Write a protein that binds this ligand. Structure first.
Ligand SMILES: [Mg+2]
Length: 254
């Protein structure tokens, strides 16, 4: 696969022949350097990648007189390339509590399989085949996030998931979904899906995705909601589900 990305990257840079070859050298040198920084904290490595993005984006416009309109495409090609290559080294580092967190969240979600959409006031009626299918399609995308290496592709999965969510809500209510309808539905989808390495995926995106795509409202709104969904689940309690500590503890055990 990576060879496919390398070919696509090299072929893509010839398109800009002049500046292209230059960017390729800079990119190859950045990776060579990251090899020597493998032992640093994931935060610092994230900083090297974030700086690399910034510095290369400001080196074309100037030295290459490249149109600020074509830059975006290029940057996406660069992220695809380097992240496709760093993935094995920066995703869920043994040097972080990423794995311990993936496990706690997984165990946590697995212990909450008794939580119903009703308890969460979720505007989703799975007794309606169409809605049920929307729900499973949503889960599919959230789960497939883990199989993607590039942060942008991981984001695309989150977006595809949320779009199935809105249709599930639309069909159930027979009208457009309200603002307050989303988050509860996403929490439900995550509870029923228990997405692989949820915490590692969230951190990876936050660490190596071009920040320009995370708080711009586009995929940023969806990403923020998923983080908010995980946090909601982490601290979910009796009152949270609209119950008395009594009931809650009953379910949680028996
Ligand atoms: Mg889909």
């Amino acid at each position: 696969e990576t060879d496919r990305v390398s070919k696509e990257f090299i072929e893509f840079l010839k398109t800009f022949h002049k500046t292209g070859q230059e960017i390729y050298k800079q990119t190859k040198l950045f990776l060579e350097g990251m090899h020597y920084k493998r032992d640093l904290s994931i935060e610092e490595q994230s900083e090297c990648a974030q700086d690399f993005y910034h510095n290369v984006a400001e080196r074309m416009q100037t030295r290459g007189k490249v149109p600020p309109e074509r830059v975006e495409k290029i940057m996406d090609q660069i992220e695809k390339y380097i992240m496709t290559r760093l993935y094995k080294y920066v995703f869920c580092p043994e040097t972080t509590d990423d794995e311990k967190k993936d496990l706690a969240i997984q165990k946590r979600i697995r212990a909450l399989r008794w939580v119903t959409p009703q308890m969460l006031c979720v505007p989703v009626n799975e007794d309606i085949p169409e809605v049920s299918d929307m729900v499973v399609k949503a889960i599919t995308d959230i789960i497939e996030m883990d199989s993607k290496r590039v942060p942008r592709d991981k984001l695309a999965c989150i977006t595809k998931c949320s779009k199935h969510i809105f249709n599930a809500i639309k069909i159930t209510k027979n009208e457009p979904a309200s603002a307050d309808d989303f988050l509860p539905t996403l929490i439900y989808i995550v509870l029923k899906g228990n997405p692989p390495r949820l915490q590692s995926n969230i951190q990876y995106i936050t660490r190596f995705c071009n920040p320009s795509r995370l708080m711009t409202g586009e995929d940023g709104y969806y990403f923020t909601n998923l983080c908010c969904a995980v946090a909601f689940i982490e601290k979910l309690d009796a009152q949270s589900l609209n119950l008395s500590q009594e009931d809650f503890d009953r379910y949680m055990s028996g």
